[PDB]
Amino acid sequence: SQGIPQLVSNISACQVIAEAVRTTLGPRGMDKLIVDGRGKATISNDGATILKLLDVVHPAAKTLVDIAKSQDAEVGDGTTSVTLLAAEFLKQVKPYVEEGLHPQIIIRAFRTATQLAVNKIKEIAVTVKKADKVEQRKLLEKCAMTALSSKLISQQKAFFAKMVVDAVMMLDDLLQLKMIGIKKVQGGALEDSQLVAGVAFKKTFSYAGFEMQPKKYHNPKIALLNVELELKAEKDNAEIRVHTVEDYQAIVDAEWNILYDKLEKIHHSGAKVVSSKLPIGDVATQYFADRDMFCAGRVPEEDLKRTMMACGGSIQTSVNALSADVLGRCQVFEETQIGGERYNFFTGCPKAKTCTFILRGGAEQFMEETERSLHDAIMIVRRAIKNDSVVAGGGAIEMELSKYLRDYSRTIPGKQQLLIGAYAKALEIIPRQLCDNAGFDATNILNKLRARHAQGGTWYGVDINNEDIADNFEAFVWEPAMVRINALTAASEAACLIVSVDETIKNPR
Amino acid sequence: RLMGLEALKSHIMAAKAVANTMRTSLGPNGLDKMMVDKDGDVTVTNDGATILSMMDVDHQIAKLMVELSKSQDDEIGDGTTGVVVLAGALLEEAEQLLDRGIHPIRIADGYEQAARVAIEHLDKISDSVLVDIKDTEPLIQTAKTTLGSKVVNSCHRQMAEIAVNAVLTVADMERRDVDFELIKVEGKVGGRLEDTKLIKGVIVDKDFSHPQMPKKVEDAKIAILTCPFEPPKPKTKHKLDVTSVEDYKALQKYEKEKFEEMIQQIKETGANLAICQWGFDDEANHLLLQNNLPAVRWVGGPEIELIAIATGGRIVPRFSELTAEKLGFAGLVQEISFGTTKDKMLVIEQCKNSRAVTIFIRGGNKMIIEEAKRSLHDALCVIRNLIRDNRVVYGGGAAEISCALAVSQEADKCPTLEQYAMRAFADALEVIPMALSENSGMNPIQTMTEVRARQVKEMNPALGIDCLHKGTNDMKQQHVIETLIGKKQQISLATQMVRMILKIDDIRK
Amino acid sequence: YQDRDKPAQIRFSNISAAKAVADAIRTSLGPKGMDKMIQDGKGDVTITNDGATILKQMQVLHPAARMLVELSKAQDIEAGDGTTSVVIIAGSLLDSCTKLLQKGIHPTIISESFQKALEKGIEILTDMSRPVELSDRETLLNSATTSLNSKVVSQYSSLLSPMSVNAVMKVIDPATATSVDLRDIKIVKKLGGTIDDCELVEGLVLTQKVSNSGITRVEKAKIGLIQFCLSAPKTDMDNQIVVSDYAQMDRVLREERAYILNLVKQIKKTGCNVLLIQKSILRDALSDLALHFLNKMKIMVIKDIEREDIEFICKTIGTKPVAHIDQFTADMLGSAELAEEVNLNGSGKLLKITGCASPGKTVTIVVRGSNKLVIEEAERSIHDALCVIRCLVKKRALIAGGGAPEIELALRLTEYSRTLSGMESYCVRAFADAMEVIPSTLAENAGLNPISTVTELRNRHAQGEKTAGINVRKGGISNILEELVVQPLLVSVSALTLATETVRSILKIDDVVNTR
């Protein structure tokens, strides 16, 4: 099949990829349940999470997946924005394919209309650095507030808005999403959410060792191990069966000197505190209490992974390789009683680029709804300090580009008039799906939004809270201009790779 | 690959299959369920957490209802059966609103808005119990009515007395921070229901090595060892194999010289009770009889470590590490014989308001024992709730009908689209007393529509539904009292599970 | 349960058969509603959106679904308007009992509960209505142009409106009498002229001709009605006319002359001057010789009278029909001052009879027009204007339109449900939700959201009054009282009583059997 009907078979495989992430547009979007072959359920609203777990077999559908694979590695998210935009470019030119228009004319007008979208955005993007003489701390407190709006923590939203702007300030210029940790523990009020400057864990170590182990340290040597120091351990045991009854005393003593010589190598290294994923028995916490050493086992490996990056050490499984090359360092080591549980944490690392934000609440649904909004509020205040030239989000930049590409289409004669005029209606998928995913009326909003853009509204968009229209530039809902440029050029390039394909060759194997 | 309204109706039909199966098991007159186990055993129960643990449904919607009951056994305890029925009729009322063309996000946010009105109505019609004084006589009568649903109704007064003292030991009433983790349950076949005892400590089902030992230990000297005071035998198995007569006769020389030296070691150390893993010899218990030394024989593996945490001692593996520092403390160590049954348990009581209680439940049939362990844990969370909050609500369906009247009245004050979600929340809240009338053998609608008329016309306080076929309504006089936190989380976790289901619109395997 | 016998499946068959009648006619409600296309068996396609025609053209054969057909027929005689809206109310009512019958409720308990919702539903529409006067001519004039503006004829709505008010004032004494008969107001239409050339005759106007009687003008007319065919002697049995010669052929012609003149001489003794003959097709009602015998006695000839026109005559002048000449008496005669034939340029050859002087008050509205499509919609505009005056006499009250009493009925019955007890609490809850379909239909037919309009209107009625509703002219929620869309109370208050007795009759039907 070459010519027209091969393009129709590729334009229908584009719909099944866009429909998998059509309802996930927006913070209030619907979740998707993807179940693998093992039987585990995965509920996520993130578009990059769904596309990694689909593994579609169609060759024309594998193109739109690999474009989103390049988007998450460089930018970080926005995989559903580049998918619905690249899909709607094809559905407008689909009745023009059966008319007899060549697919190269689709290419020649997609390269023109994309370059007009770049010149219109850079002429309209406003650099917001010290507008109206405000502090930069108050600007991130307002933009992170709209990310937490219409949520379950709207009663104390002024307190949670100050927590995101304090966590981004403690890091360096290298900002990242994976450096911040979010913990979920049950109990307490909603306003008791404290902040940790460093890495903290739940510390489920409930063995012996009390009335000892001083919690204060100035410059301790942080030991990172994966050894088990239990008496009935699976790796440290001795079973010798004999008839000799004075050898019966020896097999109980030599089994103790196996654990004693492994504990003697810990104190010989000079480590003040020791950390281990495997649990630590009571006779090993007793030995450290005699030599005045701190010990805290049963820590997760993911909490250790953020610890070795900050403290400057590394994880060593065996206890023979414990020396000063792998011991971490910190300046503040304290102990709190947040939520009734013990909490160990380090503060003042030489490589202190990681933190942890503990959540409190009376219900688990009150915590998982926040951490979906907390990771979005972190990337909003990350993009604000990074890119100062921002534009209004919520489909405000899409409705302005639909106005600029419409009247310029009437000034260009030829086959580019009916195509770039269809390119302006193809950019309407961003404000339209914001209404249907929020449950509003998509007819009354878009007809009011396009009427506001003709009268002079250049920053009006779709409000996801109310069923009104509002200036998102004044409502502190922003998006960077360079991300919108990179999302528009990637959408037209992905739409070009489906249109330019005219025949599929399958090798017989 | 299902999307649209046909995928959403597949979720409601799968979730109502779990609700309508457990709709008949609501209340004390609920129809019990037969369960065929995998090994061929057939048990019968009416507990709601037991049904969902054995219901092996391969649908992903039904597995979320199983995931719902993983946390409510520890939080609310009593509302396990009703929360599945409340979640099912909420999706059934959402099915009525689905034909009207409403998006599920407005229904999920509409159910969240209507839930806050029912939470605000619960504490207003509440009543206080434990203000300004501590008491145990009214606290028994509230737990005496709830435990009458199972087959321990003939001995329901005895469990009400010991469960009040068990919760009040490990926690303080003025601190209002109760931990249910410190109260452990046990059981064994044999005896009667009146022999259930409560210890201010940890009791081990182990006997002495000599019946002529004293039945009480007044000294706070407990030695915890691994090898007994004899020629030492290993912890796994002896496996003796004699060589010749010279090996066996030299064994006789080694037996006598350790019968006088190892018992000499307990006097220079200063201990009285000798708890060990293996038993003592027949010739060894003669010398313990003269010098007043008790000993416990044949203690299992994990039974040793649970003694040392309550007594505060340390494990002594060899005889060389025997010191006075590794001793545990206790108030009075005794042994209790349950009538003619030679049980002879190790009763370690501290004679002080301590932080360790274990309730040892007996019974003449094995089917009553595991049903009483869950009934005591159901009574464990009830008295835990009264200390944290003395506010209670009138049960028997009186709380659900009174909350449904305030929701339907406050639905008219909402000029949004979510009024239909609030009116559906009023009729879905009343399905818990409506299934109480159908399970009691009466008309489900005639009993329901006469109690709601009684709560409005002649009297403003709420009345309950006489599901036990008592004299009349107003179960405050019938002493049917449920907690406020158990009711405020009943309407919360049922609403939050609907929002997790209404946000799922695609299952792909 | 076992449930071996199934008598409720016939109730579910009776509900679903009547639900398809109301759901097919639901989108034709309102002025901006969608029209309906029908196809006859011969191939004729006629576009008509009037609900009284589509139910006549549906031709249902189910006995349960036929109960909605005469429900619309009874609304045209009792109120004269509101036709399809009773069916959608009765159709949404049986949809609400589908949820009630699945719950285990017996239908005879719903029948006594829907009557209690009807007794309460009348009380809500009474105090919320606006009482007006019948003697005030400004009220009946202004409220009729507002209802006729939404009809097909609106440019002549300022002319046909005072002609309908002035017609009923000569017949009905204003603000004293309660009974209004629309059969006493005959509308005569003929080709030629415009609608502006109209005449209000206090007597009666006939469409026939006095041919071939050459009198055409009589004073002191004693009008009499004869149903017997004044013709030649005719025997239905076997008879024979014997012939003998040529002089015998002139004798049977004289026998036909003398037999009719013997009947004519019987008319002259009672003083009758105007003869009325019924229309007869099977035999000759009037021969050629009988037309000349009444010309010699100066008696006017009137024939070709429909059976419905006979009802207009006896209430006008007091003439009773006679079956034969031997029963012709003087007591069965009427009274008239003058009878003549007036042939205008556009009114046509009509018989104008003035000067009744008889116990009885009837009027006649003579409407002219050039085309045939002009005068037929002029009569439909008059009959739509005659029904809103008849609805105001029996109920001296006015309410807003656009489904505004239907939202107030859905809110007050919900508050009434919290104070009831027993089975009647849930039936009035289903009665309240079944009344919200009429504003939800008007919200969908006006191009708005059907759920977001009726939900905002319920909150406007809890704080305000019945002024909030759906305005189909501007396309949105506005003040119906300021929009001057006012309907009489008898359109709505009879729509509830007639729909409740139909739902009570449908639910009480248990089994359907066929006899022979």
Ligand SMILES: Nc1ncnc2c1ncn2[C@@H]1O[C@H](COP(=O)(O)OP(=O)(O)OP(=O)(O)O)[C@@H](O)[C@H]1O
């Ligand atoms: N508060 C808001 N109001 C209105 N629209 C919003 C809001 N937040 C996000 N959006 C819409 O969601 C889209 C972004 O989707 P998404 O959050 O999945 O990607 P992202 O996280 O912004 O991108 P990246 O991966 O680059 O961080 C934007 O096009 C924007 O229009």
Ligand SMILES: Nc1ncnc2c1ncn2[C@@H]1O[C@H](COP(=O)(O)OP(=O)(O)OP(=O)(O)O)[C@@H](O)[C@H]1O
């Ligand atoms: N004696 C009683 N009189 C009236 N109502 C009662 C009585 N006991 C329980 N209830 C009602 O029954 C509800 C609990 O239902 P049900 O007994 O089916 O669950 P449960 O078996 O207690 O839960 P679980 O399986 O976790 O023990 C409570 O909400 C309470 O209102």
Ligand SMILES: Nc1ncnc2c1ncn2[C@@H]1O[C@H](COP(=O)(O)OP(=O)(O)OP(=O)(O)O)[C@@H](O)[C@H]1O
């Ligand atoms: N001028 C108007 N403005 C707004 N709504 C109107 C107007 N006239 C009628 N309606 C509404 O339309 C409905 C009737 O619509 P339609 O014209 O299809 O039927 P009808 O023949 O006038 O009345 P019925 O259905 O009772 O016979 C009524 O319920 C009324 O509320």
